[PDB]
Amino acid sequence: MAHFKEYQVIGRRLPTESVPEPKLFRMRIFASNEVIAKSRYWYFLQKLHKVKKASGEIVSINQINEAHPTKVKNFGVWVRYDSRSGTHNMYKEIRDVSRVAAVETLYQDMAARHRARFRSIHILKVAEIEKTADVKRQYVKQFLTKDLKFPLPHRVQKSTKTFSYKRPSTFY
Amino acid sequence: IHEIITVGPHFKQANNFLWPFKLSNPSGGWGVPRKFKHFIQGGSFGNREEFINKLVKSMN
Amino acid sequence: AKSKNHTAHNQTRKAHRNGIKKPKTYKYPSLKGVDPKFRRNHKHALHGTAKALAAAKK
Amino acid sequence: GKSHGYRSRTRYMFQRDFRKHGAVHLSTYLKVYKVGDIVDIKANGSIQKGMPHKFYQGKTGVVYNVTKSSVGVIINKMVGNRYLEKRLNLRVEHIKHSKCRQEFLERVKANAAKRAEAKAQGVAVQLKRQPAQPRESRIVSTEGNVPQTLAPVPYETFI
Amino acid sequence: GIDHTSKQHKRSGHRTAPKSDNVYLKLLVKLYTFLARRTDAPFNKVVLKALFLSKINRPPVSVSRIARALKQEGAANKTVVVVGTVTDDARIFEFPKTTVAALRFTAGARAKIVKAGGECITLDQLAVRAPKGQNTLILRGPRNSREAVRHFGMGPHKGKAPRILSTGRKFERARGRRRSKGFKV
Amino acid sequence: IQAKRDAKAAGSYYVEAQHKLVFVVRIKGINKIPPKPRKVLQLLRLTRINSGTFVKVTKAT
RNA sequence: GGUUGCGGCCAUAUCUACCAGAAAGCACCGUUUCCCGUCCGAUCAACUGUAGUUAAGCUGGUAAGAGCCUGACCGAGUAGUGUAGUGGGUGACCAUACGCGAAACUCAGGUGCUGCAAUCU
RNA sequence: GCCCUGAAAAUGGAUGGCGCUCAAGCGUGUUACCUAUACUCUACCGUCAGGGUUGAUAUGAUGCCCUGACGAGUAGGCAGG
RNA sequence: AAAUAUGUAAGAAGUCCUUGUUACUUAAUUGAACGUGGACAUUUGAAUGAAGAGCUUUUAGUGGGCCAUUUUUGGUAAGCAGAACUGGCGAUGCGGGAUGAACCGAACGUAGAGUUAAGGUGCCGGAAUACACGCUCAUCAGACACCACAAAAGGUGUUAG
RNA sequence: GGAAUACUGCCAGCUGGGACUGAGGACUGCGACGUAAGUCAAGGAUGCUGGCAUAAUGGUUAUAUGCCGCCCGUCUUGAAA
RNA sequence: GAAAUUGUUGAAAGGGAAGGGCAUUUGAUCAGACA
Ligand SMILES: [Mg+2]
Ligand SMILES: [Mg+2]
Ligand SMILES: [Mg+2]
Ligand SMILES: [Mg+2]
Ligand SMILES: [Mg+2]
Ligand SMILES: [Mg+2]
Ligand SMILES: [Mg+2]
Ligand SMILES: [Mg+2]
Ligand SMILES: [Mg+2]
Ligand SMILES: [Mg+2]
Ligand SMILES: [Mg+2]
Ligand SMILES: [Mg+2]
Ligand SMILES: [Mg+2]
Ligand SMILES: [Mg+2]
Ligand SMILES: [Mg+2]
Ligand SMILES: [Mg+2]
Ligand SMILES: [Mg+2]
Ligand SMILES: [Mg+2]
Ligand SMILES: [Mg+2]
Ligand SMILES: [Mg+2]
Ligand SMILES: [Mg+2]
Ligand SMILES: [Mg+2]
Ligand SMILES: [Mg+2]
Ligand SMILES: [Mg+2]
Ligand SMILES: [Mg+2]
Ligand SMILES: [Mg+2]
Ligand SMILES: [Mg+2]
Ligand SMILES: [Mg+2]
Ligand SMILES: [Mg+2]
Ligand SMILES: [Mg+2]
Ligand SMILES: [Mg+2]
Ligand SMILES: [Mg+2]
Ligand SMILES: [Mg+2]
Ligand SMILES: [Mg+2]
Ligand SMILES: [Mg+2]
Ligand SMILES: [Mg+2]
Ligand SMILES: [Mg+2]
Ligand SMILES: [Mg+2]
Ligand SMILES: [Mg+2]
Ligand SMILES: [Mg+2]
Ligand SMILES: [Mg+2]
Ligand SMILES: [Mg+2]
Ligand SMILES: [Mg+2]
Ligand SMILES: [Mg+2]
Ligand SMILES: [Mg+2]
Ligand SMILES: [Mg+2]
Ligand SMILES: [Mg+2]
Ligand SMILES: [Mg+2]
Ligand SMILES: [Mg+2]
Ligand SMILES: [Mg+2]
Ligand SMILES: [Mg+2]
Ligand SMILES: [Mg+2]
Ligand SMILES: [Mg+2]
Ligand SMILES: [Mg+2]
Ligand SMILES: [Mg+2]
Ligand SMILES: [Mg+2]
Ligand SMILES: [Mg+2]
Ligand SMILES: [Mg+2]
Ligand SMILES: [Mg+2]
Ligand SMILES: [Mg+2]
Ligand SMILES: [Mg+2]
Ligand SMILES: [Mg+2]
């Protein structure tokens, strides 16, 4: 939907005469601008309580920045989503260096593997797999082995003139 | 201008006094592949809140 | 040969070309279709308030 | 072939209301109409005399005549690109006064008061109505009310 | 492109000159175009348009319609302006004095007028005697007494006089004109 | 600015008043428009594309 | 407060079952000469207010009562729906965007209000 | 999910054609870039409109001057030539 | 019992005060209607707009229509037949969908500069053989709405659950 | 603990390259800078220099080239048919 | 003594029609203006 941001969003039902100061609910929305993020917020509240935008108010909207943006992390991700023929709950694991980076590539995976567009996906939970061997997925696990090393074989220097006079080489 | 921005007591008269502005197209572009969806859906229409300033400015 | 039967397609475009003219309104409508006993008395009524409003500029 | 009589299509329109059949309550006859009153028109299916044709069902108009057991109502009916003036003879069972003006009358004598009440005071009136204004700033406290975080749910069935 | 809210290039539909081609009229108009530009007086603006008026819109004002307008309370010394022609009315016996200012006075009219010591005045004379139109009484002819309007509005229950040549019974007076011949209008 | 901080100080949230003024741009061409919006685009004086006007905000606008 | 005569709204007034009602009023109740009506003085009409009674009408109160009435972020922001897109899908159909938004359900609370006139421990 | 089977018609033949396979294919994201009789600014034509100006002793008063908006078109109307 | 759609009202032709007229009407100088005299101005009674409003006369062409989304009837269906609202084609070129009455974008005076739409940028052809993450290998692969179709059913090919 | 930076936004901050246009034709207006006299980029281009004074620039025409372009009339929902 | 249509002469173009629009090369041709 773009390059993502994270957002504490906080709204409440409108105060009434018999009910001044109503209850206050938070969501952490994953979206690209604040405008979308408020919209998503209402989207999910109407799918949980008895409010709608008209009858409610947004109280606050604050972007949450990564804790340690320069630390590799192993993420567990949880997602409700819709296929062509019915809806499905899912768990994947993404390994990156921020919740925002992660949620980005999530959506790219859903797109690619299950043809799932942004509308068709609920993030359910995103949280940091702390102690390893709570990492459950091979394609991630693979990167935790100790003293990890690998080549990057058959390399491709991207040319800049239409002709070349050598005959290239993929050594690396 | 003060009368506009502060939505004054004489805002009807004030505002209407101005001929509907005539902007050019934005100079960057719309920043969207397709204009006629909502802002929130990656289109251009509807309320886009403070983000109207970036546009109008591109079109001014 | 059959041919189209009926439609109102386009009919409101036309009505709007030249209006839907609001009803138009007057102070003092007609007494048309108003009870005859009423009108009859009312007449003689008015005649009087007329007559005595003439005696005002005597 | 088609059919198009005076009450055609009026199946539910002239029906009676649930558990509301029978005698018409007597207040319907102790109401009093003068010329110039605005009334609303609803046919009473029991009372078959003096009935409004279905078109004026739901319509509202001005009393222009008063007679023994009925009133004459004028209605502007639009036909073609234009209104004409139809006047109806309606029995008093198919007519009720209109509250469409009560707010106005209410508002006027309401107005005429704070109008004087503030004239005899120190000018400063303001008595046009105004549309709903967007609400003002305000501060919301957290005391006794920390925000309860929510998140979307997973998919279930229960059937 | 523009959602046009209103028809484009509409003419105002009001006359701008006389459709007349008579110099003298053309001249009078010269006067009052000048007079109405430069004198902020309403009377001149009114008179100027009236010159553009065509024959129909200039119905004759009679000398007897004139005398009545002077019988107007407090209006016996004002000078009647008529942007048309004035005609004689044999039906009034004791026509008054005053001053009539018109385009044309029929012979009988001007006679009757002067016979009681009045005065007949071309409008340009009226102009110099009273630029701002001070103390004028503009009278208008009965536009809708033309025979042609009798027939305008024709249709059923309208009461309006057929466009009909040779009349009498036997001329559209049967079916559709009476409850005993089919029906009535 | 200091309201927003002063409430943050108190743990309370500061919600600024709803905006009162907006600025509108007709972003769509002239044709194939349905009647009721078509009128409103007029009444708001946006009768040609990329033209813009100010709107005071209340329910009735 | 009760009761009666006339009522307005017309079940929060109805329905079922039990119980209770001072005083006044109503009531039931006595009678068949008379006006009056019937197959039948039951109904209807007349007469007494005298010979009898709260049994019933009537009024109230009881019931995890039936019905009915009110309410709620109970269900449900559900169903449905006005707007949008060169959104998804072979189709059937379906998501999304800016709006409007039920009915059943469930739970709680109630079970006549009151106008004019006369009367009454 | 993509792919493969299910999958049969007549002149030779069509993702528009060539051709493309970590695509020049499918899903998705980010920028940039190309160009409509549209939009913005300007000149010019014309149409409609609102102002100004009969003051001689030179040349159009239907004129002269200032200003603003607008311009699709069958059948059909009108106008000026 | 909705949503959409739909009648009326939001003032000077308004709100009050005093008390004439009549053959209607009342037990009644009761009332009904129409008045006379008086009290209150533009925050005079919501919004937005208004290249103004109103009115009159006369006359052309037309009176085969068709298409789209949505509502919808008949029919197994139809590029079939028939209705509802709006938008269109007809009557209209211009840019896009190679092509094409009706789709998308946008409606045309003669022109310069600029910017865009919808649609595109390997080469045909103006414009990144751009960046990025996955998926896919087809001995009849696939490749952009309207649109020029494919289904049940299957696969120990492969991907994620 | 005390910084920096990103990001979003503001400046009636300064400043470079490039492209099209130069309508108007005395004066008049609103300003700006000056202590001042003055001056100005403030109600639409001027200054300086050079070239040809010709087929140089320009029209017309034929052809070549890039892109584009179906037969007109008519009836018709619909014609290049 | 027009046109259709034809002979000659001159110029030019022509890989399954010709003619047209915008634009400029080239050739041919011509105005105006310089002073
Ligand atoms: Mg964090
Ligand atoms: Mg820029
Ligand atoms: Mg650019
Ligand atoms: Mg740039
Ligand atoms: Mg695109
Ligand atoms: Mg700009
Ligand atoms: Mg047919
Ligand atoms: Mg027909
Ligand atoms: Mg039928
Ligand atoms: Mg009953
Ligand atoms: Mg009968
Ligand atoms: Mg005659
Ligand atoms: Mg006559
Ligand atoms: Mg506005
Ligand atoms: Mg007792
Ligand atoms: Mg007997
Ligand atoms: Mg008995
Ligand atoms: Mg009895
Ligand atoms: Mg008992
Ligand atoms: Mg009883
Ligand atoms: Mg119960
Ligand atoms: Mg809907
Ligand atoms: Mg679809
Ligand atoms: Mg559903
Ligand atoms: Mg294929
Ligand atoms: Mg391609
Ligand atoms: Mg791609
Ligand atoms: Mg680039
Ligand atoms: Mg152009
Ligand atoms: Mg034209
Ligand atoms: Mg036009
Ligand atoms: Mg409405
Ligand atoms: Mg309406
Ligand atoms: Mg208003
Ligand atoms: Mg206005
Ligand atoms: Mg105007
Ligand atoms: Mg006609
Ligand atoms: Mg006709
Ligand atoms: Mg006809
Ligand atoms: Mg359409
Ligand atoms: Mg046709
Ligand atoms: Mg078109
Ligand atoms: Mg094209
Ligand atoms: Mg195609
Ligand atoms: Mg569209
Ligand atoms: Mg090619
Ligand atoms: Mg290229
Ligand atoms: Mg599709
Ligand atoms: Mg399958
Ligand atoms: Mg599989
Ligand atoms: Mg110049
Ligand atoms: Mg010049
Ligand atoms: Mg020469
Ligand atoms: Mg030379
Ligand atoms: Mg040649
Ligand atoms: Mg040529
Ligand atoms: Mg071609
Ligand atoms: Mg033909
Ligand atoms: Mg045919
Ligand atoms: Mg043809
Ligand atoms: Mg010869
Ligand atoms: Mg050429």
DSSP C1-58: --------TTHHHHHHHT--B-----SS---TT--HHHHHHHHHHHHHHHHHHHGGG-
Query: Does the CB of A105 sit below 7 A from strand G?
Result: no
Is D142 in Cβ contact with F13 (below 8 Å)? yes
CA B60 to centroid of chain Cα atoms: 10
Chain A residues near residue F15 by CB distance under 8 angstroms: 57-60
Number of CB atoms found within 10 A of residue A45's CB: 21
Chain A residues near residue D153 by CB distance under 8 angstroms: 48, 80, 124
Which residue's entry shows tokens 């905000």?
F57
Please, which residues bridge with residue A75 across strands? A94, A128
The amino acid sitting at A71 is: K
Which partners does chain F have (≥3 C-beta pairs < 8 Å)?
Answer: A, B, D, E
CATH topology of A3-69 equal to that of A70-146?
yes
Among residues E96, E118, E92, which one has the least CA distance to residue E105?
E118
Whether A22 contacts A15, CB under 8 Å: yes
Among residues E34, E14, E134, which one has the least CA distance to residue E81?
E134
Chain F residues near residue D140 by CB distance under 8 angstroms: 12-15
> Which tokens belong to A75?
């993420």
CA distance B44 to F27: 8
Number of CB atoms found within 10 A of residue D56's CB: 21
Q: Which residues contact A124 (CB under 8 A, 6 or more apart)?
A: A78, A79, A80, A89, D151, D152, D153, D154
Whether A48 contacts A71, CB under 8 Å: no
Full 3-state SS string of chain D: CCCCCCCCCCCCCCCCCCCCCCCCCCHHHHCCCCCCCEEEECCCCCCCCCCCCHHHCCCEEEEEEECCCEEEEEEEEECCCEEEEEEEEEECCCEEECCCCHHHHHHHHHHHHHHHHHHHHHCCCCCCCCCCCCCCCEEECCCCCCCEECCCCCCCCCC
The amino acid sitting at F10 is: A
- Interchain contact D145–F (C-beta under 8 A): no
Q: Which of residues 4-33 of D touch strand I (CB under 7 A)?
A: none
From F16, which residue of chain A is nearest by alpha-carbon distance? A59
CATH dotted code for A70-146: 3.10.20.10
Q: Edge-to-edge strand order for the sheet containing D60-66?
A: D83-91, D70-78, D60-66, D38-41, D95-97
Resolution of the coordinates, Å = 3.2
Element (H, E) at B5: helix B2-5
DSSP class of residue E152 equals: T
Among residues D31, D86, D79, D92, which one has the least CA distance to residue D61?
D86
CA distance A133 to A37: 34
Give the Å distance between the CA of A50 and the centre of ligand 19: 56
CA distance F16 to D136: 7
| Closest residue to D65, CB basis, from C15, C16, C35 | C35
- Give the largest CA-CA distance in chain D: 75
Is A21 in Cβ contact with D145 (below 8 Å)? yes
Full 3-state SS string of E63-94: HHHHHHHHCCCCCCCCEEEEEEEEECCCCCCC
> Which tokens belong to E142?
């009965």
- Interchain contact B45–A (C-beta under 8 A): no
Whether E87 contacts E64, CB under 8 Å: no
Which partners does chain C have (≥3 C-beta pairs < 8 Å)?
Answer: D
User: Looking at domain A3-69, does it have CATH number 3.40.50.450?
Assistant: no
Among residues E98, E119, E106, E109, which one has the least CA distance to residue E64?
E109
Among residues D58, D51, D53, which one has the least CA distance to residue D91?
D51
> Which tokens belong to E39?
């004198």
Element (H, E) at A2: none
Torsion-angle region of F38 (φ positive above 0: left; ψ -120 to 50: alpha; else: beta): alpha
| Closest residue to F41, CB basis, from E1, E3, E4 | E3
Whether D57 contacts D95, CB under 8 Å: no
Cβ neighbourhood burial of D146 (10 Å; 0-12, 13-18, 19+): exposed
Whether D39 contacts D91, CB under 8 Å: no
| Closest residue to F58, CB basis, from D133, D139, D140 | D133
Please, which residues bridge with residue A93 across strands? A76
Give the Å distance between the CA of C34 and the centre of ligand 39: 40
Chain A residues near residue D149 by CB distance under 8 angstroms: 25-28
CA distance A28 to A62: 9
Annotated domain spans of chain A: 3-69, 70-146
Q: Which residues contact D126 (CB under 8 A, 6 or more apart)?
A: none
CA→C1' distance for D35 and I29 (Å): 23
**A35-38 contact pairs (CB < 8 A, 24+):** A35/B39, A35/B40, A35/B48, A35/B49, A35/B51, A36/A1, A36/B40, A37/A5, A37/A7, A37/A9, A37/A61, A38/A9
Chain A residues near residue D151 by CB distance under 8 angstroms: 27-28, 44, 124-125
| Closest residue to A26, CB basis, from D147, D154, D155 | D147
- Specify the experimental method: X-ray
CA distance E143 to E136: 21
Which residue's entry shows tokens 């009153």?
D37
- Interchain contact A53–D (C-beta under 8 A): no
Give the Å distance between the CA of B24 and the centre of ligand 2: 13
Is D80 in Cβ contact with C15 (below 8 Å)? yes
Which residue's entry shows tokens 């001929």?
B19
- Interchain contact A59–D (C-beta under 8 A): yes
- Interchain contact A39–B (C-beta under 8 A): yes
Q: Which of residues 33-92 of D touch strand I (CB under 7 A)?
A: 34-36, 38, 40, 58-61, 66, 75-76
Does the CA dihedral E154-E160-E166-E167 come out positive or negative? positive
Q: Is B33 helix (H, G, I), strand (E, B) or coil?
A: coil
DSSP F5-61: HHHHHHT-EEEPPPP-EEEEE--S-SSS--HHHHHHHHHTT--STTEEEEEE-STT-
The amino acid sitting at A95 is: R
CA distance E80 to E97: 11
CA distances from A117 to A28, A60, A81, A145 (A): 20, 28, 10, 34
Query: Dihedral of the CA atoms E13, E15, E21, E22 (nearest 10)?
Result: 160
Q: Is A83 helix (H, G, I), strand (E, B) or coil?
A: coil
CA distance A98 to A104: 10
Element (H, E) at E115: helix E107-115
CA distances from E177 to E171, E172, E173 (A): 11, 8, 6
Whether D148 contacts A25, CB under 8 Å: yes
CA distance D103 to A19: 29
Does the CA dihedral A108-A109-A113-A119 come out positive or negative? negative
The amino acid sitting at D6 is: Y
Q: Which residues contact C26 (CB under 8 A, 6 or more apart)?
A: none
